[PDB]
Write a protein that binds this ligand. Structure first.
Ligand SMILES: *[C@@H]1O[C@H](CO)[C@@H](O[C@@H]2O[C@H](CO)[C@@H](O[C@@H]3O[C@H](CO[C@H]4O[C@H](CO)[C@@H](O)[C@H](O)[C@@H]4O)[C@@H](O)[C@H](O[C@H]4O[C@H](CO)[C@@H](O)[C@H](O)[C@@H]4O)[C@@H]3O)[C@H](O)[C@H]2NC(C)=O)[C@H](O)[C@H]1NC(C)=O
Lengths: 51, 50
């Protein structure tokens, strides 16, 4: 929460969360490199063919 | 995951996996707690009071 982040969104979200809600800590290296690996539960629309 | 083959006369193997969400093994490590006798409690503890 303390740093700028990309605002990644699941565009084809069905009825769950659109973006990351679990704001876990980021690993910051001395070179300025940041790795952020949040968990999520994605509920995504998928056209189901039942033929 | 439920092994259904002998349901309802079945036995299961359920895992409980604990880890640090933030730190790698070099930064934070784990050891099992020892009992009053100094024996390592490498199992789920069961207190008869609770
Ligand atoms: C309930 O569920 C748990 C978890 O699933 C089971 O415990 C696991 O059981 C499996 C075997 O079924 C164990 O896997 C075996 O581990 C052996 C030891 O190597 C491990 O540990 C060393 C530690 O230094 C590591 O370096 C290594 O990478 C491994 O993690 C291996 O020798 C075994 O190898 C065999 O299988 C592999 C394929 O998986 C083959 O490639 C090999 O040639 C060989 O045939 C195997 O990998 C696993 O470690 C257990 N996890 C634990 C104990 O935490 C319980 O057994 C299960 N209880 C039941 C069913 O009663």
């Amino acid at each position: 929460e303390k740093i700028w982040r990309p605002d990644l969104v699941l565009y084809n979200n069905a009825d769950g969360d659109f973006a990351i809600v679990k704001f876990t800590k980021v690993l910051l290296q001395y070179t300025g490199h940041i790795t952020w690996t949040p968990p999520a539960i994605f509920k995504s629309y998928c056209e189901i063919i039942v033929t | 995951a439920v092994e259904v083959t002998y349901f309802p006369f079945d036995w299961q193997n359920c895992s409980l996996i604990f880890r640090s969400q933030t730190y790698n093994a070099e930064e934070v490590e784990f050891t099992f707690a020892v009992d009053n006798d100094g024996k390592t409690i490498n199992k789920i503890d069961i207190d008869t009071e609770a």
